[PDB]
Amino acid sequence: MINEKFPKIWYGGDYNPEQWDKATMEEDMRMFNLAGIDVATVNVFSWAKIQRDEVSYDFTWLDDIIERLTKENIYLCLATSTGAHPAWMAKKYPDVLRVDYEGRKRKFGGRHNSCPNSPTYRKYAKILAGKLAERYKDHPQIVMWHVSNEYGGYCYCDNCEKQFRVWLKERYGTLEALNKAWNTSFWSHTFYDWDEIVAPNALSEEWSGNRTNFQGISLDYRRFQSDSLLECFKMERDELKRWTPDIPVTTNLMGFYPELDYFKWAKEMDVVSWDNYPSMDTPFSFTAMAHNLMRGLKSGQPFMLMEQTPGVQNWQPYNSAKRPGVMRLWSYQAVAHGADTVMFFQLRRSVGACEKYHGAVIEHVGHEHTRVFRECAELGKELQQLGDTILDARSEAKVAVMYDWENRWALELSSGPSIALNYVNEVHKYYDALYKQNIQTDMISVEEDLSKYKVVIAPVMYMVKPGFAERVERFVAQGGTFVTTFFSGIVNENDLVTLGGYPGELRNVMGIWAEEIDALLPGHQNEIVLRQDWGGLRGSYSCGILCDVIHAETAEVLAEYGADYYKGTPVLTRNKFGNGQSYYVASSPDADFLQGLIANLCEEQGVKPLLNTPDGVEVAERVKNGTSYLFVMNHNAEEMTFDAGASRQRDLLTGKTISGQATIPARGVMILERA
Amino acid sequence: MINEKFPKIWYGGDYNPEQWDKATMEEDMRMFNLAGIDVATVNVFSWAKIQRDEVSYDFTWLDDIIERLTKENIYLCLATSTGAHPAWMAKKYPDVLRVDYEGRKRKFGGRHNSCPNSPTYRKYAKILAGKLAERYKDHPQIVMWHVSNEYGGYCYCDNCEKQFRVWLKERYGTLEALNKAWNTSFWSHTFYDWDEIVAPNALSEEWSGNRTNFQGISLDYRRFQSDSLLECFKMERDELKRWTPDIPVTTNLMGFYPELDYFKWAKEMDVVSWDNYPSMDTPFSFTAMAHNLMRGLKSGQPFMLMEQTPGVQNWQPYNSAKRPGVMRLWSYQAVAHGADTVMFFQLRRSVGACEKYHGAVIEHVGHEHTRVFRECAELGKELQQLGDTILDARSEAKVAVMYDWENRWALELSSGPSIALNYVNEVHKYYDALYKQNIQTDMISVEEDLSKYKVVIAPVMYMVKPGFAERVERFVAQGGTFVTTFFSGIVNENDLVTLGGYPGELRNVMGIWAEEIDALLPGHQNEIVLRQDWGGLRGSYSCGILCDVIHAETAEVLAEYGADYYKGTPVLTRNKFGNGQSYYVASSPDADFLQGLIANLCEEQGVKPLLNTPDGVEVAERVKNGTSYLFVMNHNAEEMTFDAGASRQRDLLTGKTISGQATIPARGVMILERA
Amino acid sequence: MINEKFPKIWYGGDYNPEQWDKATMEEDMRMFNLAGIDVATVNVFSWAKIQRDEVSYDFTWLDDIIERLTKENIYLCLATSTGAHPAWMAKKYPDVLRVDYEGRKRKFGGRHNSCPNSPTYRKYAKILAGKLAERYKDHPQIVMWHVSNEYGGYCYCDNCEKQFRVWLKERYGTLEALNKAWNTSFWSHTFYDWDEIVAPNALSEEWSGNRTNFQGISLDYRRFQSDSLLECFKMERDELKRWTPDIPVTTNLMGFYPELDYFKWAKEMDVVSWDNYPSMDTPFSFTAMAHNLMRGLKSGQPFMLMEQTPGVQNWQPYNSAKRPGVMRLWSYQAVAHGADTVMFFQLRRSVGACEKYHGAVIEHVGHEHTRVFRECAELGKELQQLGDTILDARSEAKVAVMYDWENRWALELSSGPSIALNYVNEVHKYYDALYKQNIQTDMISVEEDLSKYKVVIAPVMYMVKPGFAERVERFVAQGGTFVTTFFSGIVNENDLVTLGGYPGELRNVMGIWAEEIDALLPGHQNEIVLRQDWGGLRGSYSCGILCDVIHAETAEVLAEYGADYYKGTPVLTRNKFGNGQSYYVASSPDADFLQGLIANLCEEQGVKPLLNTPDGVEVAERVKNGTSYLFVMNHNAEEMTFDAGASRQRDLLTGKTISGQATIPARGVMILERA
Ligand SMILES: OC[C@H]1O[C@H](O)[C@H](O)[C@@H](O)[C@H]1O
Numbered sequence A, B, C: 001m002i003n004e005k006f007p008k009i010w011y012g013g014d015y016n017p018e019q020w021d022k023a024t025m026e027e028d029m030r031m032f033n034l035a036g037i038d039v040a041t042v043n044v045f046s047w048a049k050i051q052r053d054e055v056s057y058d059f060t061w062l063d064d065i066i067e068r069l070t071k072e073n074i075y076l077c078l079a080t081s082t083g084a085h086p087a088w089m090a091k092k093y094p095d096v097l098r099v100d101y102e103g104r105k106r107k108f109g110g111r112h113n114s115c116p117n118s119p120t121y122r123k124y125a126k127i128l129a130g131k132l133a134e135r136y137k138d139h140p141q142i143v144m145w146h147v148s149n150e151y152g153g154y155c156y157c158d159n160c161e162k163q164f165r166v167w168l169k170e171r172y173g174t175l176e177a178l179n180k181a182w183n184t185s186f187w188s189h190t191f192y193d194w195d196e197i198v199a200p201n202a203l204s205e206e207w208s209g210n211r212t213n214f215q216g217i218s219l220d221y222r223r224f225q226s227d228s229l230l231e232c233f234k235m236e237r238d239e240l241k242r243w244t245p246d247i248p249v250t251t252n253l254m255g256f257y258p259e260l261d262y263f264k265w266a267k268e269m270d271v272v273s274w275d276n277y278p279s280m281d282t283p284f285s286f287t288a289m290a291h292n293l294m295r296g297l298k299s300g301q302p303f304m305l306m307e308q309t310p311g312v313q314n315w316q317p318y319n320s321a322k323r324p325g326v327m328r329l330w331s332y333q334a335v336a337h338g339a340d341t342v343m344f345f346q347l348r349r350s351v352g353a354c355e356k357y358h359g360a361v362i363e364h365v366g367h368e369h370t371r372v373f374r375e376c377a378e379l380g381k382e383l384q385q386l387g388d389t390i391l392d393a394r395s396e397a398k399v400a401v402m403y404d405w406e407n408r409w410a411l412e413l414s415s416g417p418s419i420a421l422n423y424v425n426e427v428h429k430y431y432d433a434l435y436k437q438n439i440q441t442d443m444i445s446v447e448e449d450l451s452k453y454k455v456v457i458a459p460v461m462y463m464v465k466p467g468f469a470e471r472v473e474r475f476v477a478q479g480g481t482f483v484t485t486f487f488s489g490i491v492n493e494n495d496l497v498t499l500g501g502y503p504g505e506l507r508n509v510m511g512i513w514a515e516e517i518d519a520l521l522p523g524h525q526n527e528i529v530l531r532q533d534w535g536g537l538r539g540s541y542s543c544g545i546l547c548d549v550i551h552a553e554t555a556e557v558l559a560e561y562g563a564d565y566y567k568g569t570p571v572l573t574r575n576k577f578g579n580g581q582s583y584y585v586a587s588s589p590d591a592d593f594l595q596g597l598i599a600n601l602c603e604e605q606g607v608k609p610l611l612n613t614p615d616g617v618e619v620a621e622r623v624k625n626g627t628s629y630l631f632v633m634n635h636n637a638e639e640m641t642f643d644a645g646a647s648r649q650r651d652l653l654t655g656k657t658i659s660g661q662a663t664i665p666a667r668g669v670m671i672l673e674r675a
């Protein structure tokens, strides 16, 4: 369990009584009890309230808060308050403030923007973390440390530049090695001294947010920035553990957030926690993929849903309300994919600057006789009823799809082949195909051991890191199926092209050679023409974005391009390799093809849908010992019916016994417990 | 009158003979008499020509211009020239130059961009105004002082920052009050010293033009900037009045210009003046609303139309010509809504940098045998014939629609609830409905005395200021009808939410509780379904953008939502309050709905259309003692006919008597004189 | 010949073995021989490899490269390496770095961005070019110097600003002349000292990249920046010629690149060279117009195609492949328009930062067995077979179309009359119309000797420079026909309006007075209505963007507007003027109209199509002594047939004799040799 002393799915979230008075806290306690809220994430944004100058600390206001919650037996997710520095610190110690992408030195304002290489910030953040831990080391109610808040954003100030040079000395050792890694013979970029190297932003190598002249420099700067923020986190973490070695530590992550390499971050964290904020507009399968990735960060360990909104989110272009039941629907989607808490931002609306129109459990009217409150209260009761049933349950997927931040960085900084190539979208296309057939799948790093899986899919694996090729050759040889696509295997970890023919280190295992890649103008497509009927694949399908022109070497040809000067050449190939098979998809296919492809690949390996359901009825499985829990989630606005099988199963949420045909209400959720 | 000395509608405008030679002034004079031009706005942009260093002043050039015009009995609207500082001043005294929103220190260029808190600028601006007024104090031709030119734009330099702190000390008195008003407990923003406070721009609290993290800081900085600039106006005004206590002083405004609180400005000005530049694209009823607002700034006092192009305006993306008759049509539209002058930019085209392709009376050919010149000459002659007839005439509207800049600021800085919420567009939806039925209406401030009205409409009155609620309650209880809408009554003057349920201070008078608001994605609409027929409203109409979900408390439900999860809940309510009524419109309705609503509200109060006319034939009224002047303006490219009433009346522009059926030419104008 | 020692169409391009090693260099030589590559452009980007500090120079690496190539008898286009400065130079001597349009001081990065007014850059760039020419002064293989690389971009630093003032003292002599040229009495812009003048960028007069308050300043600064970069070129050219006076010198230009006045550049260059990178999306007649313009830069002298990609270009939004044969098509298109070399970027792909997905002759596979390589080899073979046949061949066009950079700058900086006016687009509409009829045409400067032409077309000759009007009056009176359009003859060289009636100095020769100009909103059009059938022109056509409202004075009216208030007024006029004719086109007309107009004008002067061919089959002519080469180029993806005429002629490429009906394959090229 996330914490043995708190044996249920925690229910609560960000709570900020210091924005209010004592009387409102009385009301908070009363309404929290009504709603079933048993955890509070406190002290996220009160650095200034605690510390008014270099030497003065006041925790009495926090003591009162902890004590009051303790009387209710509400548990505490205690934040270190380092997510936003005090105005006096920004004024007296400007080294705390970032320099942005445009080269400007910032002034006090916003949040989440301390220079990760600031001596002042690291000095006081460490001291603050250590004082909190020390003061509260013996307190029974603290179940989790919430370090800082949403680490993110890049800094380009002098300290970062000086420290980037040091990071480079440690990474490359010599300028010779650095000059080679960066391919600096190009455009006369030869460096003769480390101080000659500067941060890549709008003043130097980069422009318009995502372009660069020197991708190796941009790539390493992102690695370095990610590491620098990670050092801040570890630094607070170690200071906390020194006083409370037994209290877990997390920090709140942001899913498919591009700027940080969370696989690397996750290793430093006791448990993953994240903040999920889908729009009305966000594909439901995408937010599943994100919860999935969050579980993948620690190779399938369950994570905390640290945040979500009980209703609207102010930051969205259109503050759409969550329709009746959707809040609950989406809470259970989170649990369905590994979440062992469901927590909100926030418990009571601010009044209150930029997030006053962010939804909360208790809102501006200040009472519980509210549609939003009712739904929250219903959920809370159900979470109480569930107790520890679902805790620690894990995924037993036999299909994995790989995702990597470094690969994403390189792809997004690349100049060509097409601005229409979107890495996450391509990964999502493959994942969506699995989600639609209820094939249980894991989002995994490229370093994950492949032996538990039967199908491994690596969409656009552009960057191939040391050991990767060997590991997939092994996987496939011993009977697995591996899938990869156009524009994969191009470069190594320094964004240097692996010479001798794409797909480089994967050429052997894929059995093909990709001669050249063609980018299609917007609105232009080609067509995948099957050689002959093959399982669920039959006739013609459309493809687009990029078209790899390839030569079957070892591999067999399953489909050919239908048009253009590479008409009749291979677009889908199958390589028999050892006891396994690898598939190379030379273009970006429509959803029908990926449906047939995924169906075939799963059948080939004897992996079966968890359940068959109408479109939009999502099924995911967590397993605890031998008991299988099937989360059935109906995203449709209408009631839906499906075959649940013949097994003796009971819906954990109704108590009723389910078998054969079963109906699920609109926005409905079932948790089928079997064996 | 604006000035007893000059008892007709002034005709002329911006005149810049100092760009030319003495010889062309002879031609200007000849053509001005031909055109009926009797007022010149001189010395707008010649600060540098006058003052070449800290100590030298040359007015001899201006003497000669003033004397030449006096020979023609042309009157003078004399500017102080402070609208653009000299290049030498920006060079020797950079404190005069602004720092922009991106945090950059500007160099010399442009105009209207002196730092309003600059010691140098204030020093020399005051001296210049003073020397100008002392020199010409006894001159018989000066009818108006024209301080500076279109004040506007924000500065973020150090002097403005330090004076922001002073302005805050004066506004709040203590840091305790400041921290509370700004809700600084949010994101650890507690200020312990005034110097910790910085200006909100891209370096600190704001981004991409209208976004902020701290709307309280951003709202106050806008107030501060507006006041700072206003102080510059007042400073020059006071110095002028020292020497010429009986010459009126104005400055030229920009209508619905967002950055300055013109209601505050107008209290400092003897008369309002403004610059009307409609695109081919602009709704005729919008520019009507704009003139109307300019009338409303001083509670119905007639205003000066200081500028408009006689033809094209270079600044428009497409320099569209005014079609034959349109210059005249638009001139009288200004007069119909309260202009006692019609003046142009400019009298002779420049040669000549960025405005050489801005229209003028006399243009690059240098002669009068010109379509544009003829139309100008024709107007001039009619204005001579009208004499003093219309001067000082006033609106007798029984219907008012409210507008407020501070309200607008808070709305435009709000994070949520919708980027498709546009305040001016909402105000204009209600105004347009009135305009279409020729219901005489006043744009008014939220402070205006309400007793004169029968119907008061306050669209999206998001911010409710001290005294506002009690004022509308008294108004309604005494027999008035009040209308407001979704997202009204939310905050106070500090953008702090009024707790306890929307619409807060207006909840008692509206008879409803607004529980939550839903933002519709673009292209999504809902339905207004009438519960029963009501006047001209029947059945179902569309609404969009935002849908408030409300509960009738004291109020009666007149229509319900037809779709979504709030289907069947109230969207239009009517609360009986004392002797009057208040209507709550919970969403943004289509034109058909608002047509019906407006007809009903007017009929309920016994207010009637001025006249019934075809679409695009606008009718507005000005009343002088016991005489009514109906301006009939046909915006259509085609002749139109209408029922002029049975009353005995003549058309001032033709002398003809009109009765019963009357036709008005394409682009034509009648001014009906009646009792 | 570009160089007598190398008597064929050169074939090769950018080559960068210093990114590689000796072994790969052996493969390069082997493959270059297979492909018939005989020229290498080396040392473009190796400043830092050569010079590691202020005092140290290493050329030994370059000696070896040059020797190795000399062994294969491959010729050298030797670059000075000044297009990208060393990181140490940027670090130690920041005066080398630019300040951008946003006022920001750049840091080390990118290329082509040394401050052209930098004492450090000029010092070391001169030395480097000197040492190279001295070291290789007796080397037989060097056939061309390649100074720097793609000069471009503007700088706004202190040194440029100060030097701007010096450049203005040279241009205008006195502040009095400056203030008049710039019209500074507008907006109190009077300058009393040169140091009061600042560079125009976002800090001063300009915004949004192309907008300005003071066009005179913006216009002059662009002249100045262009002049400053030209000075850099000349500085290196002179040092080179000091040591190798008989080796020709060029730098590589960018066609219709907006920022430099290439006409002025070309006078300083021994031969023009340029870099042709069309997208899949670029009109074929446009890239023809660009090659054409490059020929015109030196009044018909053949030029170098210095670059083009052999396949894809990474910089395009969509890296689309050149379809089979297209690389060859576009190479002969260059030759057809005056190119006496065909050279690539680059010979072997980098590995390697931002250009690794730029196409090359030898690519990442590293061998010749590739579609791209074979197409290169094939062309290489033909070029060998052509030998000296086409060299020095010239255009004998009877039709000219004028283009001018200063006119372009003034038009693009102008405030109004329409953001839908695009100078180059208009120039191209006229060029296209000729292109489609295979009428041989030269792009020319406004200063070209007009005597050799029969038809001279000047689309939107907004700026009229001294001597121009006289020159066209003389051309027309001697019997030529001249064509110009709406918005021509408006200003002089300082962007000051020529008063007294548009088109000012062109009013007599055009025989019309343009009274005013109307900008159409997007999607609005008007109608060109012919008075009577006239040659290929008949009935109605559409026109748009801008409509000049004009009066026929001496000119005959051939067509009138069909709609709007100017309906029935002239839109096409013909003025007889001496033995010649002038045509004024008062709007931007559709393609069918321009087809007819062009056909008429050409018949009138007895000028005839080279050949009649199907749509998309381009024909162009070069003439050498008594021999005419017709370049026939089929851009269609389908085989096409055409009457080749009855003459005795052979296809240079097949050796076959062609007469009467001939077919040409998809993407095909024929070069008909006739008399
Ligand atoms: O297409 C890329 C190409 O762009 C220009 O032509 C440059 O001169 C070359 O060095 C190369 O950068």
Ligand SMILES: [Zn+2]
Residues within 6 Å of the ligand: A098, A099, A115, A116, A117, A118, A155, A156, A157, A158, A159, A160, A161
């Ligand atoms: Zn930093």
Ligand SMILES: [Zn+2]
Residues within 6 Å of the ligand: B098, B099, B115, B116, B117, B118, B155, B156, B157, B158, B159, B160, B161
């Ligand atoms: Zn200021």
Ligand SMILES: [Zn+2]
Residues within 6 Å of the ligand: C098, C099, C115, C116, C117, C118, C155, C156, C157, C158, C159, C160, C161
């Ligand atoms: Zn410079």
